[PDB]
Design brief:
- The PDB classes it as biosynthetic protein.
- Keywords: staphylopine biosynthesis, biosynthetic protein.
- Two copies of one chain form a homodimer.
- Chain A is an alpha/beta fold.
- Chain A has two domains: 1-208, no CATH class; 209-428, no CATH class.
- The first copy, chain A, contains 16 helices and 15 strands.
- The complex binds NADP nicotinamide-adenine-dinucleotide phosphate (NAP) (2 copies) and ligand 8UX (2 copies).
- The site of one NADP nicotinamide-adenine-dinucleotide phosphate (NAP) has 22 residues of chain B, from helix 1, helix 2 and strand 9.
Chain lengths: 428, 428
């Protein structure tokens, strides 16, 4: 009956409301004031109101709203003490190791379940291997992705969040097939009316995330990298066609390639492959039936390389607008394409930060590169994504010697995580 | 020293100014008051001012401007009498036969040169065969296209025209290789600083028109045909992607197919094939080097079918905007794509007209279908374009029994033209 929620962002608050209303756990949450003015605003705000709040936008999601109070908000990870049966990781996947290793020996020995909300590929292996020094039979659970979109509308009230969308389908894998925990999640899922698919293992669920395959080619190329680190003369956009954005036959080739390096790795683990196009079309944003042939979507994996690229290119062109939106009187639809790049930025202590795109993709990609080596698999497109990103960081360093920079710029991070995957893989 | 110019549109007026300033011909022109309120406005306007005028927009085209007076404006074709050495066809290609057959026996016997300004594929054969009953050694000349863009700014002054663009390259073929006429055109071409390419025959020049390959798939499909004959709830556009316009993997397949049916026919006549993509890109509107690989443009004809379609699709997507135009401060370029469909319309005597797209493409396509049969070549995509167009006409007839309709709606036109090609082809 004790639960530790690592995160104080909108994901963590949404999940905390779910555990509050539909579980028997006493819930403690943990951010970082030792480290983050964002966490400190949240802590200060919760301290004042003594309540979090989830609101909703679409009323089909009633189950998820509610005002609530938790048992204990910890200010910083090191402050955590005592025993916790279940731990929920509602932070970024590149902090899972860093954050667990700060918990006490006493705390780590008590843990039976670690649930990973937004894992990358390989996150369960890292977390299973690290937890193995403390429990003997740790249960680790992976979702494909967070269940929807939650955000803070007002930065000044970060304890008040708004869930706007919910995903059509999530996946879920456990180190312990059909555990009590697994069945409790499933039951919970249908309370919330969220289609959930249970799959053989955590790895399997972690590969059912489109962003794995799409974010790296989209953000780790010279066009995107310039827009983020250097800036451009006129605004450019993530989803537009060159020169308005990065998308190009080249970019699409790099995506097919990285997709296949990935399906090589998953054949090794005997995990089914992903029909990337079907995923995209039947689970993210839909296109008109006239745009793509149902038989090409369905057989995507057996079709020729050039044809796969064609189909992908076409997918992106189809979503320049929202083809199901309400066109205005001139035949013009909503410019769904016009998503700006987030650029490098100085936090309130004047330190240069790299935004989540592509920071977190560096992490994801670095991990898949390291899995790759250990397994005897090639990854030249991955290697290329990383080279490009490492070069832009260095270039930023050379170009901005007078500015304070974050550890995100440094080489080569994730040693602990790499070691942990190394170790895990030796064993099986 | 007598020249007959058939046409009183802006093409004819531009060409008449050229002959006036740079030839030794007495120039007569001929329209149709028996038939056209457009021709009658022009005749009335010329009658009043006793002068035509070409103005220019870009000053790189000086040579082409000028005010001028011709020897005789005929009101109608049948009014033509006397002898003419040279005849210039500045009318639509589907009227060449109809209009020549109205001239007197005396006139037709005098003619030595017929110059065809905007021929379709097969136009020279039609005109050579028909002229063979009158001259014995008629010279027929074909250009790829008219030399640029001329228009009337003000409908009320249709004797005043504006040439806005000039083509990068035209082609030119004669039944009489390297004739005096051929050399006089070439000399004239460089006076005007218009790159001209001389090719082996008229047929050869007639296939160096992108519209031959592009207009039929773009306009003779259900989406386009609906927009023209029926209308749509919101405006749609010729060059946009579905659902904003017709362009679709399907449409692109139909274009590759019709392109190849065409290259089958041209192999028979031992005429070189057209690299459709190179034509498009290096001679019409240019795209950024990052959009297409130079090696793919260059080797286009030997590349796989699916890849050819990909490349074409990409070409069209690249020209949604003008990628060389001056983007505004939000990163947005000129919406070069937003060309409306011209719809069926009632002339001033309440008769329903079908616009040039796709009227003239019906003609072009009907001719290539007829060449096809006679030569023992397949054309199922052509047949399909025509079937579709014939069906929409009929549907229009069934749906608008209370409205006066033009002969453009009727089946099956061009018998004379077909017979003439039949005859020509038997002989060689
Ligand atoms: N709707 C969504 O926002 C959404 C949707 C899909 C997936 N996700 C993913 O789920 C995770 C949490 O989402 P969120 O919206 O709650 O984001 P967030 O507010 O940035 O939450 C991350 C939480 O972990 C902390 N943290 C620890 N180490 C961190 C590091 N290295 N970088 C950044 N934060 C770190 C953050 O502290 P501070 O608050 O002090 O920064 C915060 O409390 C993220 O990976 C996110 O990409 C979110
Ligand atoms: N810049 C351009 O406009 C341009 C560019 C490239 C190619 N072209 C082509 O060159 C030809 C002439 O161009 P234009 O701009 O001078 O067009 P236009 O004004 O419509 O000229 C066609 C001339 O021929 C007459 N005509 C005879 N039979 C006709 C028929 N069945 N349908 C339509 N007109 C007929 C027209 O009479 P009325 O004047 O009484 O209609 C007119 O005098 C057209 O085929 C056009 O597509 C034009
Ligand atoms: C913003 C960041 N990542 C999103 C992905 C957001 N990507 C979509 C993808 C997309 C493709 N076409 C239009 N939108 C977007 O840019 O809004 C997520 O994990 O759900 C996050 O975790 O909050
Ligand atoms: C309008 C008609 N046909 C044109 C073709 C015009 N087609 C272009 C082609 C195009 C492709 N992308 C943008 N424009 C257009 O629609 O303006 C010609 O023969 O030069 C004419 O003869 O005057």
């Amino acid at each position: 009956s004790k639960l530790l929620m690592i995160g104080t962002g909108p994901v963590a608050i949404q999940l905390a409301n779910i555990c509050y209303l539909k579980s028997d756990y006493e819930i403690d949450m943990v951010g970082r004031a030792s480290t983050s003015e964002k966490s400190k605003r949240l802590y200060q705000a919760y301290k004042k109101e003594k309540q979090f709040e989830v609101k909703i936008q679409n009323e089909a999601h009633q189950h998820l709203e509610g005002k609530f109070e938790i048992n204990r908000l910890y200010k910083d990870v090191k402050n955590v003490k005592g025993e916790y049966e279940t731990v929920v990781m509602a932070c970024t996947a590149d902090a899972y190791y860093d954050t667990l290793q700060q918990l006490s020996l006493e705390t780590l020995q008590s843990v039976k379940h670690v649930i990973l909300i937004s894992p990358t590929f390989g996150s369960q292996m890292i977390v299973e291997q690290f937890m193995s020094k403390f429990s003997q039979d740790i249960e680790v659970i992976s979702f494909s992705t967070y269940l929807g979109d939650t955000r803070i509308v007002d930065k000044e009230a970060p304890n008040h969040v708004l869930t706007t969308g919910v995903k059509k389908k999530l996946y879920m894998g456990s180190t312990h097939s059909n555990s009590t925990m697994c069945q409790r999640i499933s039951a919970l899922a249908e309370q919330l009316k969220i289609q959930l698919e249970v799959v053989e293992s955590p790895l399997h669920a972690e590969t059912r995330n489109s962003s794995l395959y799409v974010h790296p080619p989209l953000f780790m190329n010279d066009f995107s990298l310039k827009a983020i680190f250097e800036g451009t003369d006129v605004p450019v956009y993530v989803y537009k066609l060159f020169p308005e954005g990065p998308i190009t036959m080249t970019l699409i080739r790099e995506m097919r390639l990285m997709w296949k390096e990935m399906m090589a790795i998953l054949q090794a683990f005997r995990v089914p492959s992903v029909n990337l196009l079907q995923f995209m079309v039947k689970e993210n944003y839909p296109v008109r039936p006239e745009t793509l042939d149902e038989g090409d979507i369905e057989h995507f994996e057996i079709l020729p390389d050039i044809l796969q690229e064609y189909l992908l290119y076409v997918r992106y062109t189809a979503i320049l607008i929202d083809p199901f939106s309400q066109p205005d009187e001139n035949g013009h639809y909503f410019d769904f394409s016009a998503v700006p790049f987030k650029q490098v930025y100085k936090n309130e202590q004047d330190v240069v930060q790299i935004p989540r795109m592509p920071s977190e993709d560096y992490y994801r990609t670095a991990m898949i590169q390291h899995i790759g080596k250990m397994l005897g698999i090639k990854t030249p497109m991955i290697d290329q994504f990383l080279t490009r990103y490492e070069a832009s960081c260095q270039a930023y360093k050379d170009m901005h010697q007078d500015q304070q920079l974050s550890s995100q710029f440094n080489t080569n991070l994730f040693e602990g995580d790499k070691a942990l995957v190394t170790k895990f893989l030796e064993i099986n």
